[PDB]
């Protein structure tokens, strides 16, 4: 089973995330895909992430600053990025796989998320130490 890398995009005010839903399923989640072959876990995030929303991770990335998660076999590390501008014009590189792209008020999926109609993936087992980490970016 092979390992997942994505990333957790925030914006330069630390109040937005970045998630991405799939053409297949209504669930929304990290820009993220699996390792290809050889490949470190960085450089998987950066051709992942630029291949669904079209933007480069390269001089954003921290190699130290992730969290991980083991889910149904599958090891998930997603990158903890922030100061990614709210006006950049995302868009998918690839074909058949992303259907949208939207900026999300993280406070108000934290308040909302257990009451809502709308679904996710991975940031629901992975709030905790987002919340964590967007303080301790403050
Ligand atoms: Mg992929």
Not at 1 to 23: D, M
Not at 50 to 76: A, H, M, S, V, W
């Amino acid at each position: 089973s092979i390992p997942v890398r994505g990333a957790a995009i925030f914006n330069e005010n630390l109040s937005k995330i970045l998630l991405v839903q799939g053409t297949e399923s209504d669930s929304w989640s990290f820009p993220r895909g699996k390792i290809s072959k050889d490949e470190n876990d960085i450089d998987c995030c950066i051709r992942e992430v630029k291949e669904q929303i079209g933007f480069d991770l390269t001089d954003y990335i921290d190699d130290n600053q992730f969290i991980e998660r083991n889910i149904q076999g599958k090891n998930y590390k997603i990158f903890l990025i922030s100061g990614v501008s709210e006006v950049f014009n995302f868009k998918p590189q690839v074909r058949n796989e992303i259907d949208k792209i939207e900026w999300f008020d993280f406070k108000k999926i934290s308040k909302t998320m257990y009451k809502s109609n709308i679904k996710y993936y991975l940031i629901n087992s992975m709030m905790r130490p987002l919340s964590m980490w967007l303080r301790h970016q403050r």
